[model samples]
Target: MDPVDPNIEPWNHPGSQPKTACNRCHCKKCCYHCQVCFIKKGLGISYGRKKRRQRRRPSQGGQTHQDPIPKQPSSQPRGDPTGPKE
Candidate 1:
């Protein structure tokens, strides 16, 4: 169900509540593209989604699915499997 409150935009709040919301989007993928840059101008933010990214781990072994590349290929026949395989 799409949000009803105008203060709570889809990504931010019902309509235009605030930035510090539970599901605030810094990348601005909520509102539709328009004549005026809603995200940039409306929100007054640089980007809709923040540039913050998860720290890369130098992990290996069991917990991590290190790139060993499967040898047997896929058994699921053929379909829209999307990107690279296991």
Candidate 2:
């Protein structure tokens, strides 16, 4: 959110209500961006649902995968298994 000036306006609160900004953003009002931001902003007085990130299928081996495995070449068959075996 933009800071207080001409185009953007500073956040306002009524009476003793908390007017705190979220850790991620300095928003005075809660929005879709931050449920965590809102919870932190209100300090138990406010409520919002956090947007969770999507998870992907894990790669082979262990933690994270990056590089591609190398391939090996095969030599010509001695007699070609297609014909009757010697």
Candidate 3:
């Protein structure tokens, strides 16, 4: 099964269920790490093998990014940590 979620991953459909379900794979986690690196380098919004990302908006034209500043509360889904470093 797709670790993120099966609903959106056709490759992880029921037919893909392994006979030895207990056995796990590392490819998914590796892909997650690569995706994290891409985001860290400002390459994109997000990316992953098991999880696909929505189209990312261009970088804010009025601002130059620096520091790890926390976003304001006006942002939606403040605590919903669905992507990256799970």
> The CA-based lDDT of model 3 is what?
0.26
What is candidate 1's lDDT per residue for 1-86, written digit by digit as tens? 11111321222221333454343234544332222222334231222332233312333211111111223242122221211432
Give all candidates' CA lDDT scores. 0.25, 0.22, 0.26
Give lDDT: candidate 1, residue 56.
27
Best by lDDT: 3
Provide the clashing-pair count of each candidate structure. 18, 0, 0
Ranking the candidates on lDDT from highest down gives 3, 1, 2
Q: Rank the candidates by TM-score, best first.
A: 3, 1, 2
For model 2, name the residue pairs that clash: none
- TM-score of model 2 vs. true structure: 0.12
Candidate 2 backbone overlaps, count: 0
Report each candidate's C-alpha RMSD, comma-separated, in the order given.
17.6, 26.5, 13.6
lDDT of 3 by residue, 1-86 (tens): 12233122221222343365432234554232231222323333322332253422343321112112233222112222322311
lDDT-wise, the better of 1 and 3 is 3
Put down candidate 2 lDDT per residue, 1-86, tens digits, no spaces.
01111211121112133565433445555242232212234222222221232222432221111111121122113211211111
**Model 2: lDDT to the true structure:** 0.22
Best by TM-score: 3
RMSD of model 3, in Å? Answer: 13.6
For model 1, state the Cα shift of residue 56 in Å: 23
What would the TM-scores of all predictions be? Answer: 0.13, 0.12, 0.16
